[PDB]
Design a protein around this ligand. Sequence first.
Ligand SMILES: Cc1cccc(Cl)c1NC(=O)c1cnc(Nc2cccc(C(=O)NCC(C)(C)CN)c2)s1
Length: 273
Amino acid sequence: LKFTTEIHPSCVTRQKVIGAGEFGEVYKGMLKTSSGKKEVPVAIKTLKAGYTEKQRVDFLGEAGIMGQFSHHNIIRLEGVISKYKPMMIITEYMENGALDKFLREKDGEFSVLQLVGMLRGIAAGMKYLANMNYVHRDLAARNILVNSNLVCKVSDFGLPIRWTAPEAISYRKFTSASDVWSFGIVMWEVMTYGERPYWELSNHEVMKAINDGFRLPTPMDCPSAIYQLMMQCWQQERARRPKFADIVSILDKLIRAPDSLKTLADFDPVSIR
Ligand SMILES: Cc1cccc(Cl)c1NC(=O)c1cnc(Nc2cccc(C(=O)NCC(C)(C)CN)c2)s1
């Protein structure tokens, strides 16, 4: 297993709170590295006093998982503070935060090519994860982070019906192929600027629609090839779904011949006459 750096508390400064929970908080801060020669912005997640053994195992387990990975589209672990309390996980700082929230605050502002490029990055991260024999099980735009350069990184590895493939819902059969289903939902989240999958439907109503063969309709301004790809991610029979390598390849081919993205899937209308 790859080595997780134990960071000395004197090397970490917390500057601003960016989120809080029952278990602890997430801060923006700075990390001194390379034995004082380098300083980088970081995110810092804490586990505050009173945490249980299960909470510790999950908390440091996520750091141990993250530390195994070295990929452009996976959040980088700087290290952990475990010898002192409160314990901390320290990652690179992603300036634009969670992808779903980011897109909802930037509705309509990106090009189709930019959105497809975000999906290519997420797909490359997922291909890496799956190849490393990791199943994410909770892939959703809320677990993707975005930096100032619009690079998207798979970010939350702690482990939600409407992102989950039918065989994972009904049989707990979580695999890379059920992650591919989830990726298809993420494609829809991105192309809609963070719409809620299935809108007002309840979890039971989503299960009803999907098992009857219903699938999410096309986003507005969505290339036909992109809608076709997310539909293939939602094949009921998992063996018929693309592998992440197929997804990355298809997205690459579309980006390299961008006029291919100008053929749009029909956005089915509300009658205004
Ligand atoms: C530290 C850590 C441990 C385990 C797992 C992970 Cl993924 C992390 N790292 C992080 O959670 C984060 C890394 N980068 C983050 N950036 C972030 C998250 C949420 C909000 C913002 C942010 O600054 N958003 C802009 C707004 C609009 C909220 C104004 N500040 C930025 S959060």
